[PDB]
Amino acid sequence: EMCEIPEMDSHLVEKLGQHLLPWMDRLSLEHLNPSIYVGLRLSSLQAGTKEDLYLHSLKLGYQQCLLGSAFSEDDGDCQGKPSMGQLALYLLALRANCEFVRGHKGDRLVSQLKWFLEDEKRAIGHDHKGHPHTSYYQYGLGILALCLHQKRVHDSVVDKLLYAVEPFHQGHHSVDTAAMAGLAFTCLKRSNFNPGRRQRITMAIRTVREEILKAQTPEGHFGNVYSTPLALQFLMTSPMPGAELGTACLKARVALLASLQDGAFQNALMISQLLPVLNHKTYIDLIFPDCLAPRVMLEPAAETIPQTQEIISVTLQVLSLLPPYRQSISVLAGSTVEDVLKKAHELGGFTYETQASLSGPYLTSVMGKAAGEREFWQLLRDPNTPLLQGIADYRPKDGETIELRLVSW
Ligand code: B12
Numbered sequence: 001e002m003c004e005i006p007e008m009d010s011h012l013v014e015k016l017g018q019h020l021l022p023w024m025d026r027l028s029l030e031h032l033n034p035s036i037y038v039g040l041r042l043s044s045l046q047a048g049t050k051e052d053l054y055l056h057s058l059k060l061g062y063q064q065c066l067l068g069s070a071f072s073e074d075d076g077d078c079q080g081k082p083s084m085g086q087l088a089l090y091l092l093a094l095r096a097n098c099e100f101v102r103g104h105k106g107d108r109l110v111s112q113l114k115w116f117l118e119d120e121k122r123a124i125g126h127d128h129k130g131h132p133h134t135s136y137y138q139y140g141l142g143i144l145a146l147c148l149h150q151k152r153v154h155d156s157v158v159d160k161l162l163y164a165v166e167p168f169h170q171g172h173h174s175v176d177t178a179a180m181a182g183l184a185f186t187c188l189k190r191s192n193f194n195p196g197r198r199q200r201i202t203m204a205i206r207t208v209r210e211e212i213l214k215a216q217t218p219e220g221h222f223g224n225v226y227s228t229p230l231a232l233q234f235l236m237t238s239p240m241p242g243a244e245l246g247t248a249c250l251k252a253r254v255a256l257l258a259s260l261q262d263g264a265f266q267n268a269l270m271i272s273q274l275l276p277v278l279n280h281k282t283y284i285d286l287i288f289p290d291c292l293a294p295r296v297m298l299e300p301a302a303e304t305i306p307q308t309q310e311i312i313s314v315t316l317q318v319l320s321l322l323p324p325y326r327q328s329i330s331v332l333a334g335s336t337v338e339d340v341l342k343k344a345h346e347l348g349g350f351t352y353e354t355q356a357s358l359s360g361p362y363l364t365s366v367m368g369k370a371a372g373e374r375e376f377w378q379l380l381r382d383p384n385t386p387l388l389q390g391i392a393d394y395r396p397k398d399g400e401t402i403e404l405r406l407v408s409w
Contacts, residue, residue: 042275055093113142113145117153141184213244221252310398312399313329317382318403351367354391376406
């Protein structure tokens with residue numbers, strides 16, 4: 001149809017699936033990723049028996065931790081617990097296996113996620129002035145999740161998502177939050193969930209595609225390379241032709257195909273967001289999913305690029321702190337930013353804290369300064385160009401400088 005990408009080189013898709021393959025074995029609570037599972041099921045690729053065991057661990061961990069305690073066993077956080085944002089994605093994972101939340105534990109989880117959105121609605125406080133504690137992205141994903149499990153939220157919850165769509169938004173992220181918000185609305189619209197806002201919701205969806213389609217860079221991308229998959233995902237639901245989508249969507253293909261054969265898609269989460277798209281599938285396909293639709297097996301990557309020894313110098317610097325820190329760390333070539341961070345800690349006076357996430361290690365504290373409220377520890381490559389990847393996916397080159405900067409958004 002109108003916003004459609006033709007199929008790609010069968011082995012390029014297979015290449016991406018092979019990146020996911022080593023994750024199907026890290027069933028650790030701090031490595032289980034519902035987005036990966038959803039990724040596979042909606043792709044043209046299929047792991048194998050590993051899948052079912054992965055889903056089982058998801059069901060185990062996510063329920064064992066989010067439900068199962070009365071007066072608490074006198075501990076701080078004895079699992080860490082999945083975030084409510086993470087719970088939302090787990091719900092899509094269930095859908096990926098053609099399942100609805102079953103039993104009391106189902107009722108409990110649904111109830112929990114409805115509460116999260118309710119707190120995030122208080123956090124905003126009416127239709128002006130105030131941010132969610134998480135982000136409008138998880139807010140949109142919360143609404144979408146429950147909508148896929150045939151659970152409705154009150155109009156006052158949808159209201160806040162409706163409002164964020166109009167203005168707001170600066171810097172690449174906008175395009176993802178728009179796409180997510182956009183998808184949520186599609187869902188609601190396709191089942192008439194908030195009738196009192198039916199006409200209102202349709203307008204918003206129309207608002208979203210303008211915002212997104214407007215943000216198409218001359219390369220062909222939507223916002224950036226990593227905002228493109230989720231953008232396309234949303235745009236593959238909009239049924240209004242003319243011409244607009246046709247060429248713009250087909251342009252994105254070129255921009256994507258280029259980046260793809262460049263190795264831009266290293267991150268497991270990002271592969272799992274593109275794979276459905278690559279298979280003409282969206283998260284909206286999780287309303288009526290096809291569990292019998294066949295997918296080709298994935299052989300183990302088996303061979304692993306051995307690379308080559310070449311010791312390189314990378315300058316790590318932290319301004320935005322007490323005495324500014326800067327030290328030329330020496331690592332093996334192909335090392336990740338996290339390796340540079342790691343060597344610095346053991347080398348001298350440097351520390352850092354991370355958190356796990358569906359996206360990988362998230363940098364939270366540097367040199368003993370934990371990021372506050374609407375601030376975060378930005379990653380940058382000198383001069384002043386923010387990184388498109390995290391500490392665990394960016395592999396700096398010789399003589400490069402990395403800045404860890406505490407900005408506020
Ligand atoms: C929310 C968000 C943020 C927020 C998070 C704070 C908040 N609001 O609570 C802010 C604005 C701070 C942010 C910053 C960054 N982000 Co961000 N972010 C997102 C967004 C919109 C949604 C993620 C989300 O909420 N997921 C839902 C829940 C279920 O997932 P989760 O794993 O539990 O969510 C946590 C992590 O995703 C983490 N997080 C957010 N961004 C990133 C990026 C990386 C690399 C990692 C490891 C973690 C991480 O924030 C969430 C917890 O609050 C996505 C869009 C997308 N398409 O995924 C981009 C996205 C994940 N971010 C991205 C990037 C590049 C970054 C930064 C590295 C930017 C930078 N140059 O410094 C930083 C991370 C800083 C760090 N210390 O590592 C990319 C990752 C691309 C890739 N190939 O890995 C994405 C896809 C956006 C994009 N299109 O470029 N981000």
